[PDB]
């Protein structure tokens, strides 16, 4: 069973340097073409680098002079050294095996490399109050960094009809997220609705009650 398990990815400031590792099981790294291929957030796949069985290394123009591919045979690992990082390098990376010199037949699970020049900041939680039949309410979790954020409703008691929107990166460098839910409007005054926001990178938990408005 061919299994590629990747690790080492994480948050890092621009200009930094990371070392992505990919451990293999079921085949030899020294005898196979081993490639790194990344996927930008909301974009297709681009082949990053490759190491041949004979030690030959090749890189793309976008990573030439900044990335270095290597393989360790005693522990059958693949290393990708990332230097001079920029926001363009933010992506989910995959180590892959090349069968028949070009076919990426077996992949890994992927590791995330996030390059941002911010600082860790806690979120500010604001309500989105309602106002026939179905009523929509929600929470705006603004100005936090970095991802992720777990948002529940009524400490998990309310799961039907919840839509948590993906966080977008504002121009200020922090993230903004919206968590909305549709409920029976009749229960708006006779039921307490709390959105629970947990942001572990800053260890910030906010329980915000959403009560109707005028």
């Amino acid at each position: 069973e061919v299994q590629l398990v990747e690790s080492g990815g994480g948050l890092i400031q621009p200009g930094g340097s990371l070392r992505l590792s990919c451990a293999a099981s079921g085949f030899t790294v020294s005898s196979n073409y081993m490639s790194w291929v990344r996927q930008a957030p909301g974009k297709g796949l681009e082949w990053v680098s490759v190491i041949y069985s004979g030690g030959s290394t090749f890189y793309a123009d976008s990573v030439k002079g900044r990335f270095t591919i290597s393989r360790d045979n005693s522990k059958n690992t693949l290393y990708l050294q990332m230097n001079s990082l920029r926001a363009e390098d933010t992506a989910v990376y995959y180590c892959a095996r090349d069968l028949g010199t070009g076919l990426f037949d077996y992949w890994g699970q992927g590791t995330l490399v996030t390059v941002s020049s911010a600082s860790t900041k806690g979120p500010s939680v604001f309500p989105l109050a309602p106002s026939g039949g179905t009523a929509a309410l929600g929470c705006l979790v603004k100005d936090y960094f970095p991802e992720p954020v777990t948002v529940s409703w009524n400490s998990g008691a309310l799961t039907s009809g919840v839509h948590t929107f993906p966080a977008v990166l504002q121009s200020s460098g922090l993230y903004s997220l919206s968590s909305v839910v549709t409920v029976p409007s009749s229960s708006l005054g006779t039921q307490t609705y709390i959105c629970n926001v947990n942001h572990k990178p800053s260890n910030t938990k906010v329980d915000k009650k959403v009560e109707p408005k005028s």
Partner: protein, 214 residues
């Protein structure tokens, strides 16, 4: 850098229907140097077809490939719930290993009009110094939808950010949140704030508006 162009960009088909994706190359690649890959959201790619007509190990007999020269075709004979994902074509004949820009295959539900709600900024957020007006489009299809912001019937563009949810698991619907962030002064300088939704499911564009402080 032989240019692969996939067609279409997004293919809306229901389970059971026959999917036909196209990959057209700028320069001819030999028939046995085009591969078709599958990728699901949050998952690594998966080699489906090698040599443009041969199936990878494990791949059902509903996936198929054909073509030659510059034109290639990926055929899903009968669609399954599990097949709805992104698909890529890659040429690996020359040295520049290039991918296609992607082709998404998604479940077509009947055109559903978005339930449009609007959320003005709260008093806490207005005390914070900035105001973000939220516009929620709930349970609509397709994903293509236009959201316009009008401050006193004046179209504001370039200061609002959109966020789209993943396709729902049951009804295959979308939810969109458009956040218009503006200063407290610019918020209090006007009265009428409107979100205008232009969608294929709406015979007439729907305007959800509010008046500041009412």
């Amino acid at each position: 850098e032989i240019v692969l162009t996939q067609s279409p960009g997004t293919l809306s088909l229901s389970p059971g229907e026959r999917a036909t994706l196209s990959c057209r190359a700028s320069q001819s690649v030999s028939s046995s140097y085009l591969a078709w890959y599958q990728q699901k959201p949050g998952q690594a790619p998966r080699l489906l077809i090698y040599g443009a007509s041969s199936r990878a190990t494990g791949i059902p007999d509903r996936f198929s490939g054909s073509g030659s020269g510059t034109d290639f075709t990926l055929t899903i004979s009968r669609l399954e719930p599990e097949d709805f994902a992104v698909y890529y074509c890659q040429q690996y004949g020359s040295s520049p290993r290039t991918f296609g820009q992607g082709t998404k295959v998604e479940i077509k539900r009947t055109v559903a009009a978005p339930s449009v709600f609007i959320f003005p900024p709260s008093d806490e957020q207005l005390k914070s110094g900035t105001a973000s007006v939220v516009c929620l489009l709930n349970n609509f299809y397709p994903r293509e939808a236009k959201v316009q912001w009008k401050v006193d019937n004046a179209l504001q563009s370039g200061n609002s950010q959109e966020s789209v949810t993943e396709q729902d698991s049951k009804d295959s619907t979308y939810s969109l949140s458009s956040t218009l962030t503006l200063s407290k002064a610019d918020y209090e300088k006007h009265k009428v704030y409107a979100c205008e939704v232009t969608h294929q499911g709406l015979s007439s564009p729907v305007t959800k508006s509010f008046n500041r402080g009412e």
